[PDB]
């Protein structure tokens, strides 16, 4: 009848918790049987139940000394720093959803397979492996894949828009800036944050320039654009909800309307990628069930003779919206 | 001339006084006009959420402020024609209310006893000055002038240099900009601008600006060659402008930055930094604009080249420092 | 009965409609009056910075909103006496503008052909209702009624519960309160209240509230026995109230917590928690007040005892749940 | 003993150095220990989100900072017992990591060859010091001492004045407190304080503090007579403490305020205001506490009387000014 794959989550963080929320929301056939993090079940249960961005959890949440009990289903809880020591076989976890931020390579995520898992989907960029943005390149997946990435939230915002432009007009070259909600990689107060000096600064009190590979590594998702895009971010003080701008030279001359029509078609019957003509703002994207929502109000054609710059803008809930992509990619990946 | 009125003792109006005092200008602020009591303008001048305690004594009477022992009269006239500028002999008006941003509207100050007007904002087709870019275009004959937006003072110095070094054939800007008094505290009507109605401290808010569209008033060769907009975000002040240009020659990142370093050298209006700074590091800047070499980006594919150049600006104090520079000169011609 | 008009389609006005459709009220909102166009009101209704998108369809015409298929008139009359309520037979007016907070002012809606008025704010010495504290004082002869402030709906059930069980001999209240529309986005005049002139999202701002001073309107036996104020702080919504009381009885923490839990049992207005919640956990509460057992504190030396009790409340939606409970009762009398 | 080491070059550690140079102290900071490179510490000192550019020059080598042209050694030892303090002769350690908050734990600094420790936080039953309250208790043979929290530095001088003038029979404190490094940028594990795991800049978060409970260490006669806790809120620094006391005498507001004014006179640690300030007006304060006459409140029902007294504090820089006063005395015993 139905494919009932068994899933473990490594890192029950902002993304790891929303992975469970979303799986339950869509009545997915996957069963989350295990969770690994660095803390007790009490603390994970508190964090699951009460959420500063998405509000109370829509299901019952309890804990024992070794487990979460979520809508009456037990989920084992482990606390292993090192993934080779995670006992994934004890509850039969075959596809690990890897969200700790510390295993973003084939060699590192390998430890999940040494531990007895069968596959791993990485919730972040992970070098030169298969990297999937759903409804842009998920067809490249097949039965032989064992470690896969879904890139960043910014790649999931960028890829759909860039794909549509490429397919319709060509992109000669382009540059991206995402005005991006602050995340857990930043700092609450001015203090050391590894090697990235700017990341050390109080994230709710500054505009902080910040580097991102969403553009530079786009060719993993859209091969014909390898080397053609660059970009960065500015981290700003909103808790989630992000916007991505892109300034392109296209392969032909365009009008605003024409760009917008082409994107509209591309969003039609597309559960991953949305369209809006409304004068929305970042908080309106919070809880979005898209990876990306193209905003036709922000389209801008600048032109002098045959020279033409095209600016296109796309919103994304870098938290929940990404996660809806991650889950779509996970449902497909899990049944191969 | 050295007798000045401030109309609109707001964020910008109060800082104007602070900067004049700070640089010991031989300009005298003799009179102020807002919509409220001297007691409230005193509290506001004395206590600033962004820049701290006023660095001088502030006291009030029923009809005036006492600021470093100097009397400044305070009027509450909604309409500019009703302001008794003549009373204390106010010659040049610094227009910081937002309601008199045209030649015809700011004319009301002239009709009321003033000679010149300097508008703290874009003001249509009018002489519009970024200091150390086109301040040489001002003469004795000028009565009413503008110093554009803070965004224009960030963008213009950067644009001048790029144009002079390499030429800009076309370009589009985005300013990631601190929230201002034109936005809302809570979701609620704010004229026809739908986005401006949204809670400014809890949102990234796209917002129009003509800093790029009206750049031709400041840099005539760039007329019609630029476009842009803003993203208002939740910082109280401190902003940053990104320009993506197609230039007139091939360039390297080192090449772009050296030309900027050059243009910023002995330039009290336009600074340079190669440090990994952030918006709060720009608060209290004495520049109109600070080009940031660390964010320079060349995207090249063949013939085709895109060039991202980024400058910081304190949209409040920094802009003001440009406004005084422009004012001091305007008062002498 | 049945048919309702809203004056002031703001934070509270909009949420009134949302709570009404959420609970599938027989009450029918037939007209809305504000100062702006249907387009803007539609935009604001569709898109909410604190509760997300509106759960129903929202469209408009030049003179109306169309919400979940149902047409609702929009009027733009600044003086209540001119609102044409008789056109759609608006009987009960929900007064959420903040400009008609007295019997004298709100009776204008009656002059405009409404039958009753429910004011969403304190409004002097008139009937004043916190649901499930004193809604039993309502009768068929009440024509103008207040539901006080959000802060009042927070404090009252906490204080009733204390008064009944142990007695409050004297007390003082402090609410750490989300910022509102009455405060300032940037430093600038906000009437005569100096502190409210300061930037709401960048400051802790002391603020007066009448919630405790006027508590005798809801709990007569406490009249004149409480005082209090607010420290307005940078959260968009969600608030918390501390009451420090001298009781008429020696108590333990557990004893105080049992009495509160009993008072919250089967109480749709008044909730209980012993979880380590924070303000955003209350956003979207269906209660006027939620007592927090975790923060209860008994300080004693001999027979001198201080008791601190604390209650959360979503001063936007939580309060509105109370305003709608009051409204549906008002209309069946 | 003019030679000093800093452990924890964080928010407090770095401001400790800012302040010593601000007051031209003859204390000599010779070594710093933390967990990171001199590059990163130099950046953090140069550029500060709350207080802006360091007023003196800042460079670095692969094992040192160079501050105002003067060399400071930089170690990276996570266990204080391994810090080579004898290399450059650091005889007094200013312990600002938060991991050494007891005599047991800070004894390590003495094992590592230093002679005294001054802990920038509460640290159990040890000599704990609020400057201009109990710095008379410091003694030649004290080797490990505390300056408690900044909240203790806000509370204690207010309670001292009240105790001295009227007696405090019993009292309870609530501080409305800026967020700090012990909280979280996003929702996630934060040891075993559940509330501490919550986004600090998007929530009002209750949080325990022993300021009141451990006041007996600073004012022996108030031992056991106070309790309290904090509400952590989204402002970056700048905090306020409320205290509700039952006093030993019957009093008016003018009387309380006048007592407080007398205690603040010529007191470099304890300030006074009747101005209508807000939190950002305390950022940069050179007091440990500034008492605010405007929020004084007497609640009375015959015999019974509650007194609410409120004091501001810059939990970072203000506190630091007290830490430095105490350090300067300590080095001369
Ligand atoms: N905006 C976003 O938040 C966002 C969007 C897209 C992708 N991502 C990616 O997803 C991953 C997680 O992001 P996040 O914001 O949820 O981080 P987070 O800190 O919110 O969550 C990380 C979790 O992992 C745990 N952890 C840390 N090291 C661990 C280890 N060795 N083993 C097990 N658990 C460990 C932490 O306790 C925490 O609960 C990152 O790779 C990030 O780039 C984040
Ligand atoms: N804040 C910035 O970033 C910034 C930067 C550059 C330029 N400006 C420009 O300067 C002007 C003022 O900006 P702001 O941010 O200080 O605005 P603001 O809202 O802080 O201040 C406006 C002031 O003018 C007063 N006012 C309003 N109507 C008036 C009238 N009819 N007569 C007298 N006074 C009146 C208000 O009471 C207030 O004190 C605007 O045109 C704006 O575009 C602002
Ligand atoms: N936000 C809260 O926490 C809260 C909680 C409880 C009660 N209240 C009370 O509810 C009332 C409104 O609060 P709010 O936060 O919704 O205010 P708000 O400013 O969000 O909305 C007021 C609305 O009324 C409109 N308005 C102003 N003058 C008007 C007039 N003459 N005619 C018609 N409409 C007019 C405004 O345009 C706006 O849409 C106030 O009395 C307030 O005390 C507010
Ligand atoms: N910020 C305030 O409001 C405030 C006020 C008064 C007292 N304090 C106290 O002072 C101390 C520090 O507070 P803060 O806000 O500066 O914290 P912080 O996190 O900003 O500073 C801590 C510093 O210590 C370093 N550190 C951590 N572990 C270490 C170790 N094992 N060895 C050496 N260095 C280490 C960190 O890298 C960081 O630079 C705490 O005890 C705190 O209670 C803080
Ligand atoms: O305590 C007062 C109310 O809850 C909110 O008041 P306001 O919205 O009128 O400022
Ligand atoms: O009140 C200030 C305290 O001393 C600081 O507590 P903290 O350890 O959370 O910074």
Numbering used by the authors:
A (entry chain Q): -2 to 333
B (entry chain R), C (entry chain O), D (entry chain P): 1 to 333
Which text from the study accompanies this structure?
Glyceraldehyde-3-phosphate dehydrogenase (GAPDH) is a highly conserved enzyme involved in the ubiquitous process of glycolysis and presents a loop (residues 208–215 of Escherichia coli GAPDH) in two alternative conformations (I and II). All the structures reported in this paper have four subunits: O, P, Q, and R. Each subunit contained two domains: the C-terminal catalytic domain and the N-terminal NAD+-binding domain.
The enzymatic activity of wild-type EcGAPDH1 was 3.84 × 104 times higher than that of C150S and 8.13 × 103 times higher than that of H177A. The analysis of the Q subunit of C150S.NAD.G3P and the O subunit of the thioacyl intermediate revealed that there are three differences. First, O1 of G3P is opposite to His177 in terms of its thioacyl intermediate structure, while it is oriented towards His177 in C150S.NAD.G3P. Second, the phosphate of G3P of the thioacyl intermediate is positioned in the “new Pi” site, while it is in the “Ps” site in C150S.NAD.G3P. Third, the loop that contains amino acid residues 208–215 is in conformation I in C150S.NAD.G3P, while it has two conformations in the thioacyl intermediate. In C150S.NAD.G3P, two hydrogen bonds are formed between O1 of G3P and Oγ of Thr209, while the O2 of G3P with the Nε of His177 strengthens the aldehyde form.
